[PDB]
From a paper:
Mpro is a cysteine protease that cleaves at no less than 11 sites on the replicase polyproteins. Initially, Mpro releases itself from the polyproteins through autocleavage. Then the mature Mpro forms a functional homodimer and transcleaves pp1a and pp1ab. Given its essential role in the viral life cycle and the absence of closely related homologs in the human genome, Mpro is considered an attractive target for anti-CoV drug development (12–14).
The AB dimer is almost identical to the A′B′ dimer, with an rmsd of 0.065 Å for all Cα atoms. Similar conformation was observed in SARS-CoV Mpro, suggesting this is an important intermediate state for these two viral proteases in the cleavage cycle. This structure therefore represents the postcleavage state for SARS-CoV-2 Mpro in the processing of the nsp5|6 substrate, where the P1′ to P4′ portion has already been released. The P1 to P6 sites take on conformations similar to those in the precleavage state. At the active center, the complete carboxyl terminus of Q3569 (P1 site) is close to the thiol group of the C145 nucleophile whose thiol sulfur is 3.8 Å from the Nε2 of the base H41. The alignment of protomer A and protomer B shows that the loop connecting domains I and II serves as a hinge, which allows domain III to rotate by ∼5°.
Numbering used by the authors:
A (entry chain C), B (entry chain D), C (entry chain A), D (entry chain B): 1 to 306
The structure:
């Protein structure tokens, strides 16, 4: 059957992407019903970004000062509002391609698909995970701002990310669709730095369950451990602690494999403790942590014998 | 910045996916203008895939034997014909979401996006390379047959792949959109295999150029070499040979990148001979070979698809 | 005199439940006369389930390799044989609580009571219907295998289900008591998935008749339709087609109510189109389809005027 | 996995059901040791239920006036006594199938299984909640009087209900096994009425906890909130108030769940104002309130009754 990093079909998001121009500044907007959402820094010049008073900058702007283009058609702005670090433009027309949607704030370790856009036009779709330090290892160039991250569940799009900025490391920072940054980042030109990042343990454990299903079992051992002594070990190798919720989420893969969450944890403890040889697990030289348990279950579609 | 496995925006393809049912067999079809393209093995029952006479099986069916569903709405079949291993169903209605399209046959080492579909409903998109042995390392479950692969340029979708079958290895085989298999595979359940797999050298070289553009230069070697030197070492490491044709196509990635080709080859030779050992490239310990020169240029300059 | 999902009294089945252990594997067995029935996968390890050859696995096992416990008393195995996906263990003692029984294979849409058991000990009893896709929406954990489904008719138990496995959805698969799976499922660890499910129309129609008997009649209209046009409509809403047998089975509820099967069908067709303005029928927000016509007649012991 | 309204295994209760006849009146009795418990209204004739003097009616009867049948075998009555609204008939023989039992009085919102019996013969088992207004929404026909409700812990049956009568609404009234009515109801044909009705908040909350353990998590609103502002909002939707005792009892689930308490209340508030938009919880569009915390724990960990 095989196993691969897959993104959601991007079509439902493609039908919402628009271009937003304010003065000399252009980035991407999301057109849902009669609202267009983008980063509020669209109203800013590079000089404005040094000490930005967004309230003053916005009172000085009018509806006419916002050019919103949905391909060929101009959309008239009939109202402009600000919520946290995102801007909302009320327009003449409701997007007739508006999908069933939700705004959700995701947790560190959860995954979503990014549609990288420029000038309101899709370039690319890729799968990524919200890192523990509230950054994403993305692919974004100048003009990518306003690109969204999302999940699709039942023809319902859960928008979970809007792109704002790139950090020294080359990793990316943004907001949920309510304007609130992930992490301790701000939309102003000052010295910021991504905190030391950590490996998403629950995702590594799901990846190992995927490895077992696809033929690789060399790493598995007979022994088990208790939960706290694994977590102590995890801190030593910069792995996130494993919540009971994480164990509970691992339940289905445990059921199919017949390998207890705490059993898999013990095998992982020794992979990290002794280091490893030049071994590829699931055709990877390094442990992959941007697959969630639900990602692995979605693709492997195995059964449980009770 | 950043570098990620990027798929094309799938929206234009999503609008063409339909379900095709013949007897108790259902798989995916591609609805372009007033034609629906699907694997001809849709006419084959679950019991009969051993060694079928496709000509006989098709003449014994008429148009009413083909149920085509485009979401809720039934599409009337007004004609059936077979071209190579693909079935073409003429329907009374032209897909109003038909994009500007082309049918192309791709070369070993070239990349495309797969839209994994089930029951005519797109589930996922991933980027894929046609392997040297004319297989793809895909992610497919039962019901995935008729899923297509494609490239986009400007507004024009180039369909290059239709999924037909899975081999013993777990790798996948299919056709171009004219019904001709990639590799020496047949749409009958027999002992077939190609395990002539090699690493796509020209793709690895472009991936390294992408690493240079995005700030990874740790691996780089200061000295220069000759083209003969690569082929010896490459065969030992299971890497395909290189040609002046490949170098000519790499001309852009020797310009802004402004780096020599055999210098990159020397860096690969030493890293392949002994592992990078704790130092990673674009977040990966392993040389990745599913990026073409044009893939790196599109991603690093942000080309958009209207 | 209300209406509620009722299961059969479980006592006669409880007197047949035993524990079966083979090596490290334990599940439930049914003890009828001098035979104990369980899933054949009791002889399998988790590794065996990857590619199980049951014939070899069973020839290697002996009678004394099967530990059969009926509470405190050990039952000696004097013979083992396999029939389809069920294992049959002959023991030296006939269950003195053996009830009058039959093995029947039920149809999609028929209902039965499940006695969920662990370690040969009853946990619970619930009512469920065999879904059209040959799955059951059950409640089963690890160790539930060998749990049976049944109907009781005249102090005679009709066993119709034995639990084997859980699918990705969280729905359940099993066999009749001759070892033949309901649906296209196999007792192997491979990629399986439940087909898209459909609503049991004849059961929905019985539920509506129950609604009328208990006071709720708002949905009833002045008009009728013919049979095929409703069936056409049913396909649109994913409802099973209504066979003449189904009309015939609906005869008694039609007789009491004085509402023709085809009259009730028309009311359903209109509550199918535009759903309805959100409200409860028989205390339910959604159409219930795990009541059979015979279930409704059993509870609503009404009179037919002539 | 899965979640079902599950009733206790009824076998231990089935072995205690007998038929009690006085004049032309027959109903069900409970045979424990050498005592048979039944409604005292068995001594009342069809005509004389308006306002009877139970003391006078009983003194005018002797032991021979009571016919007790346990299947085919006649049980001789050697003593009759009345305790509250229950008649106790001493018989010469102890029920050899007497289980380990207890008599308990349950609180509003607690659950039990009803074994619906007719002519001393069990017909059905269902799970029931004692409603706030001290009624049960049951399924009873003529002949159902004396049917009992019960819980099981270990090998010990806790009898908590005996059915006496049906009210105008179609809901049901009865006693504990000491003859004291639940609610302000009397075994006399007068104008009496339930009237009160709330949804059992603590039970709805546990149902949501069950949904989480089984996978449904679409509904969640992952905020924190106060207990007071829930109480105000819940009364507006006619939901019972909450207590710290209730929170304390919900402590055990929170260990496995790893989930906050106030979050569920917000999710309920928004579902109560939203309709659920057609998307269901454990297969239900309506909040279900006939599951206690211990019901969810017993069902999700598979406890068994020896």
């Amino acid at each position: 059957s095989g196993f691969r990093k897959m993104a959601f079909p991007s079509g439902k998001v493609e039908g919402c992407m628009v271009q937003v121009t304010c003065g000399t500044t252009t980035l991407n907007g999301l057109w849902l019903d009669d609202v267009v959402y983008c980063p509020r820094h669209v109203i800013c010049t590079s000089e404005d970004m040094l000490n930005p008073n967004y309230e003053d900058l916005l009172i000085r702007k009018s509806n006419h000062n916002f050019l919103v283009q949905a391909g060929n058609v101009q959309l008239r702005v009939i109202g402009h509002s600000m919520q946290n670090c995102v801007l909302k433009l009320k327009v003449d027309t409701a997007n007739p391609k508006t999908p069933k949607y939700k705004f959700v704030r995701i947790q560190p370790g959860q995954t979503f698909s990014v549609l990288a856009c420029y000038n309101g036009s899709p370039s690319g779709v890729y799968q990524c995970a919200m890192r523990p330090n509230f950054t994403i290892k993305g692919s974004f160039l100048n003009g990518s701002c306003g690109s969204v991250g999302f999940n699709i569940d039942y023809d319902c799009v859960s928008f979970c990310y809007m792109h704002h900025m790139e950090l020294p490391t080359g990793v990316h920072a943004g907001t949920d669709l309510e304007g609130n940054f992930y992490g301790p980042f701000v939309d102003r030109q000052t010295a910021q730095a991504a905190g030391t990042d950590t490996t998403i343990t629950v995702n590594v454990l799901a990846w190992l369950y995927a490895a077992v299903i696809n033929g690789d079992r060399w790493f598995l051992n007979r022994f088990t451990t208790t939960l706290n002594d694994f977590n102590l070990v995890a801190m030593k190798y910069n792995y996130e602690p494993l919540t009971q919720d994480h164990v509970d989420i691992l339940g289905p893969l445990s059921a199919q494999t017949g390998i207890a969450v705490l059993d898999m944890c013990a095998s992982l403890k020794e992979l990290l403790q002794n280091g490893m040889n030049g071994r590829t697990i699931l055709g990877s030289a390094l442990l992959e942590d941007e697959f969630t348990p639900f990602d692995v279950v979605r693709q492997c579609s195995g059964v449980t014998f009770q």
